[PDB]
Design a protein around this ligand. Structure first.
Ligand SMILES: [Zn+2]
Ligand SMILES: [Zn+2]
Ligand SMILES: [Zn+2]
Ligand SMILES: [Zn+2]
Ligand SMILES: [Zn+2]
Ligand SMILES: [Zn+2]
Ligand SMILES: [Zn+2]
Ligand SMILES: [Zn+2]
Lengths: 337, 337, 337, 337
């Protein structure tokens, strides 16, 4: 089978033939139809995160395809089921986190396409209990990104705890923001899109966003004041010092600021105002199998559609390239068939 | 009527005769029997907060006493009712915050002994709807610190989400700290007291604290760890960057780190861990009229007692010196009879 | 001023001149532009409920209109503010219910057009803290059913716990039913409309409802099995024994069955299944001042429109006649100008 | 090995030597040290519940003992661990219920000592992922009842949603009731014990209960009114027509009635009053693995202790004799060593 191996950090990826994995108990082998690409893959190749991966490594925590074989004793999935292998490759199922509904946080979790081989290959071995069925009415192309940025974003929106009728501010109408907006709408919310790019605010608006501001150009929080009483919550999709300061100020008292990005730097946050106004700052990323079942169904119903550009496995290095100069419109799925 | 009065900032106050206030509609006239003192009264005195008070000012948002006359309109209180006047002097009662359970954040709120004359005097004019009744079984001197330290700490504990069985770390065993521990135990929780004085830790243990550490010499997070598996939550009662930092690291994944102090500067949270481990950082101060009633009732049942020292009004300045010098263990309550 | 007046029970009401009421401290005087009618106004008329009203009485708790004078004390309202007088005429605003978010349950509540004169007259005296403002963008005739049907149904939907994506069954597509469906949709929900008239089911479908059943020629519970896997919840808007048993059986395990009707008799629940499957049976009526504000805002944004028929005061008895005969489709709103 | 086999319904159980079971993948073999008996077991003998068991059957869903062998692939349990096999023998792990945290409700669940052999034998095959470790500081004797009576009751208490400070009424200080009281105390609550026998009301008070009342002698609901203000919730441990009516009436408006009984009959509830007071009626039984770990730990800390009478396997039929007569005080554990 063919794959895209990261042999050495920061080095271009090899598109070589590799040994096609074997499967023992409780596993499935999956023939990969597509696999979405996001910044996380790139950081895996560059090797520049506290915990770094084991080389060589096939990336892809957004791989989706067909269950080709089912190892001894797996019963809840049949050959030929349409299926996806999300970031949470496996978790213990036994610790407290797992028994709460926070398997996403399990200390002994293995991560797809980072600590084990993932979706940048023709085939992928997966943990049967931990793969998720893609519903019929939803294409492989479309589903792939629902596995990262869909759930990440959807779950974030559940986490804001904003309820139908209330207002969320989405910060950054890129690959997260652009799908956030649709989820927030499908979730009963009124949206404020916030972005430096006048064309992204245009997109967000076709996408359902109720109000746009461009935080240049004028004052974003003073506009959300202003206007809508200040938003109930904000989702930050490109967390940076000024992105956060904005979200923070625009949120009404008691509001939540949910941070979904993964930047290297430490913040800071005002303590006085946070205490005086009981502001909530919360990290969230990916989400539960159930979160994903739920996020996938919204897409399955037309309520959210991702802006994809298809590419083949071999153009991967060009796509990281591109990604690193920040020239990617939403998300890049890789075709394998 | 005599009062402690703030004439100029950073200047000794003047115990002196002033005008005994007149009452209008929905107001009551309270004869102060005792008033609590905390750092907040002092920051008023020094006038060093972003929104400074207007001089002259009688401080005290921890005053309790007897209702001497009802204003017209008020029908829910009678002459002789033992009552208190919280930091939350008044709220509009109509804004959205007021119709959630969030009067504490009302944009129109007035603050006792800050934006209006408070409890450092023989009498106080108060908004009837906003006074909280003291249970019969609890004395004036005991009740008074429950009006700030009690509610603030109790509320903080509720906001943590922590359920009977779970673990909290209380950071700093001072005025808030030592009452925080008692509320924690009364609420089903298991407690790790954390402080730099081994004396405070000894006091914590007396108050029910399950486990102590001091933090210089190890290392709280890792003790805590090691050990209870990391606490479900932390309440930080004196926020220095090192306290908040340890608080942050001791908290297990999914955990809530409730901030309760009001220091001037900003403190930096590491975005990457905050997102990855689903951390919550939350500000909280004081509480609802109902929060307070609940806070008060635990004390009535003898499940939390404050460490009070009683000084007469005339000694207020002497007490601010010992405050600046950091010498007050527990809480000082002013007497007025 | 003129009014429809209940002089003796079960007798036709007399349209006649009466005293235009005078206002004291904290009240306002509203000039009624329109007032909704519901079964509850008729149960007052017939005096057949456990706690009967004192005669003579002006019914109507869906009265909306212009504020014509502000009582002394009231500061949050001005003359010409378009306002409504909900069933919750007033509460003590001090008890525990009132300081949760449960004013709806206050032991001292007074009810509009039941314990005190209400909306069936040119003027009405109301408790200022308790009138709810009507959005600018919404007319009197539309607003008025939102003051009973809207909140009761919207709240009811919230109380079910059902989150965006999940399924509810709205049982009975009448005055409540047809507004329930619209709220349900605006709230992110998927809706199974259930009624005996195939006509109502067509109406439901126009209103946004995803699936209908009759039951009553199919099995409804089994339809819902089947289908959607059983609904997360049911709001039962006309509680007859059969509707309840059907509702109860259609709900999936863990489910909530929210009751909203007020029939005289008792309905039996199967203790053994209720425990085994963790079912919840919950009563809900009307809602908070804040509940209504939210209910009202959905209508302002055009997401729920009530089907109204307008009649002048003089035609009231003709409308109670059509009410008993069960002929009123949707809601009737009385005009007074 | 020897077991207590239900060969024919209602017929006395045969203590007979039977085939020691074998274990495959994902399973464990357990040597039973003890096994609690309760009403459920008896209803498996008598065969008188909607879904009846397959015969022969070895009852016991409170069996606790030692992991004698681990089947291929299990990794969390190790040979020699102390362990228990609760009512929920197994569930699918993949349906919605399972992924909410409602495995208790899974349509595909097997039940121990009912739909498969459980604890009334010397040995018991079990689903590795579904057994729970008994904490070290807790005897097999003490733990056995925590596996059914403990959780059912602990969980019930979480479900009431009552919080530290509030009041719950435990109805029936028998087998469940007597441990409920301790749990509610441990959970921060204030308890009202309600029982016909002064016997039990004395026991309850030793066990921590704040107030008692015999529904003889006098009005239970009016006493609770009265007094405490009406309880926030009631757990009903012996559901009967008049028990339930009492709990119902004593609950304050907004309160919850958690039913924990398994009586054969239907049971009227008032609809009018339920709606008007937003009352909640909720079935609950057993609970999650995590619910059970938590319930076990309270006992481990000496916060709840079960009143046990030990008996060997042979007197099992003597125990059902007394039980059907209702002369058992607390719970009967069977010894197997
Ligand atoms: Zn990704
Ligand atoms: Zn785990
Ligand atoms: Zn204070
Ligand atoms: Zn306000
Ligand atoms: Zn009505
Ligand atoms: Zn009240
Ligand atoms: Zn049992
Ligand atoms: Zn299941």
């Amino acid at each position: 089978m063919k794959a895209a191996v990261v042999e050495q950090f920061k080095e271009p990826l090899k598109i070589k033939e590799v040994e096609k994995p074997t499967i023992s108990y409780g596993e499935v082998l999956v023939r990969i139809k597509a696999c979405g690409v996001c910044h996380t893959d790139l950081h895996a190749a560059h090797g520049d995160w506290p915990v770094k991966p084991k080389l060589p490594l096939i990336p892809g925590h957004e791989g989706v395809g067909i269950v080709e074989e089912v190892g001894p004793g797996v019963t809840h999935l049949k050959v030929g089921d349409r299926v996806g292998i999300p970031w949470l490759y496996s978790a213990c199922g036994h610790c407290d986190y797992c028994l709460s509904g926070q398997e996403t946080l399990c200390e002994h979790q293995k991560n797809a396409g980072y600590s084990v081989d993932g979706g940048y290959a023709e085939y992928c071995r997966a943990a049967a209990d931990y793969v998720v069925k893609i519903p019929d009415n939803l294409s492989f192309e479309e589903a792939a990104p629902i596995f990262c940025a869909g759930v990440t974003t959807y779950k974030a929106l559940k986490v804001t705890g904003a309820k139908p009728g209330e207002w969320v501010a989405i910060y950054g109408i890129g690959g997260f923001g652009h799908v956030a907006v649709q989820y927030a709408k499908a979730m009963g919310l009124n949206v404020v899109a916030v972005d430096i790019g006048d064309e992204k605010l245009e997109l967000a608006k076709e996408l359902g966003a109720d109000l746009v501001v461009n935080p240049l150009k004028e004052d974003a929080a003073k506009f959300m004041k202003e206007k809508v009483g200040g938003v109930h919550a904000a989702v930050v999709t490109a967390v940076s010092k000024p992105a956060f300061q904005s979200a923070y100020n625009s949120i009404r008292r008691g509001g939540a600021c949910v941070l979904v990005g993964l930047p290297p730097e430490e913040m800071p946050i005002p303590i006085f105002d946070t205490v005086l106004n009981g502001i909530k700052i919360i990290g969230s990323i990916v989400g539960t199998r159930k979160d994903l079942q739920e996020a996938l169904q919204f897409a399955a119903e037309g309520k959210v559609k991702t802006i994809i550009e298809v590419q083949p496995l071999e153009k991967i290095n060009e796509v990281f390239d591109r990604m690193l100069k920040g020239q990617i419109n939403g998300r890049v799925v890789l075709t394998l068939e």
